[PDB]
Structures are given as structure tokens and as C-alpha cells.
């Protein structure tokens, strides 16, 4: 992508989105990141949509294959999918470390990137057998939580989505169901008290998911 203009990469990422070509969309946004300028709010969202779709297809295949596994063929093909999944997560973590996080221009942007870092270590944790990977996920999420509580309102949709995901980490990955429940419940109650200030449609969608999970866990 090095010979194509930054503006052209961003335009083609939007075309690939409309066409449902998510592998191409991700390659175009990686090219744009490596140009070295800071991303706008619409550009961060393109980068997130592209990789989440690619890694989402790989996770749903790994789970079908793990379930079949319970002749070396099933184990071989499951390991193949697993290594491609790991390559995608390691490419994203490399972009965030080099140098999106360090160069971010404000709180809103730095929180978005640290949430992404926690999400991609968490996807690595799902297929590992590791304690170190879980410790890296927890630490990225905790740094994002600390900044967001000081710099953004309780209804901001990135603050809310960050709390939802850190809650799922506690319940599904780190075996702390008490911590997941308490976080989800405190998060929902504080956003509820702040609705009157909305902006209002964005927040209520993630609140609903917090409540759904509470019902399941409780």
C-alpha cells in the first residue's frame, strides 16, 4: 500500500465496506495507519469495523472445529485456523504499539485504542492454555478505565462499550463472576442517572446489553 495516497486508501476502505470485502478493508486501513498521521473519529471506526469482522469469522470457525475435536485431520485443521487467528491479533497489537497509543492527541482517542488492546489480548486468551496473556488484557482495560472515569461522561458510548467488554473478560476469561456482576450493575446505574443530559440513542443500545448479561449471570 506504500505507493497509494492516504486519501485514496481511506476512500477504498469505504468501498470495500459497502461490498462486504472485509479482508481488503483491513489491508487498506493498515496502509492508512502506516502513513503516520493521527486518525479522525470516522477513521478509527473504519479500522475497528474491518478487523473485528475478520477476527469474528475466524473465532466462529475455531469454535465449530474445537467442538468437533471434543486420525490427526481435525486437530491439524483447528491448529491451522488457530495460527491465522493469532497472526491477525498480533498484526493489530503491532499497530497499536507502533505508534497509535503513544501519539494519540487526547483522552477520547487514547481510551479507544487501549480498549482495542484489551479486546485483542482477550481473543488470544480464548485459544491459549497464557496467564501472562490474561495479565496483559487486564492491564490495558484498567488503564483505559482510569482515564475514562476522569475525562468522559458516564453516558459516552466508548466508556460504556469499554465497561461492557471488561465485564465479559471478568466473567468468561478470568473466573471472577462477582467482579463482572458488580461492574455491570454500577455501570448501568450511573448511565441511567445521566440520560437527562443527552446522544441518547447511542447510549441506550449498550445499556440493554449490560442488562441482558446481568439476567444471564444472576
Amino acid at each position: 500500500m506504500g505507493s497509494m495516497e492516504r486519501a485514496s486508501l481511506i476512500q477504498k476502505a469505504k468501498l470495500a465496506e459497502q461490498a462486504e470485502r472485509y479482508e481488503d478493508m483491513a489491508a487498506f486501513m493498515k496502509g492508512a495507519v502506516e502513513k503516520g498521521e493521527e486518525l479522525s473519529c470516522e477513521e478509527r471506526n473504519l479500522l475497528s469495523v474491518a478487523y473485528k469482522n475478520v477476527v469474528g469469522g475466524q473465532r466462529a470457525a475455531w469454535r465449530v472445529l474445537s467442538s468437533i475435536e471434543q486420525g490427526p485431520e481435525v486437530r491439524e485443521y483447528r491448529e491451522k485456523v488457530e495460527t491465522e487467528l493469532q497472526g491477525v491479533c498480533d498484526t493489530v497489537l503491532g499497530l497499536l504499539d507502533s505508534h497509535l497509543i503513544k501519539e494519540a492527541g487526547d483522552a477520547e482517542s487514547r481510551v479507544f485504542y487501549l480498549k482495542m488492546k484489551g479486546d485483542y489480548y482477550r481473543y488470544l486468551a480464548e485459544v491459549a492454555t497464557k496467564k501472562r496473556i490474561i495479565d496483559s488484557a487486564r492491564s490495558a482495560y484498567q488503564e483505559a478505565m482510569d482515564i475514562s472515569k476522569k475525562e468522559m461522561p458516564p453516558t459516552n458510548p466508548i466508556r460504556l462499550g469499554l465497561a461492557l467488554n471488561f465485564s465479559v473478560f471478568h466473567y468468561e476469561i478470568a473466573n471472577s463472576p462477582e467482579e463482572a456482576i458488580s461492574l455491570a450493575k454500577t455501570t448501568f446505574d450511573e448511565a441511567m442517572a445521566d440520560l437527562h443530559t443527552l446522544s441518547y440513542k447511542d447510549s441506550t443500545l449498550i445499556m440493554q446489553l449490560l442488562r441482558d448479561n446481568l439476567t444471564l449471570w444472576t
Binding site: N45, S48, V49, K52, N53, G56, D119, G161, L164, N165, S167, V168, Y171, E172, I206, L209, D212, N213, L216, W217
Partner: peptide, 8 residues
């Protein structure tokens, strides 16, 4: 499975 943030 619990639900995480959807891909807007």
C-alpha cells in the same frame, strides 16, 4: 455466551 460490544 455473554454478549460484548457489537460491531457498529
Amino acid at each position: 455466551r455473554s454478549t460484548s460490544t457489537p460491531n457498529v
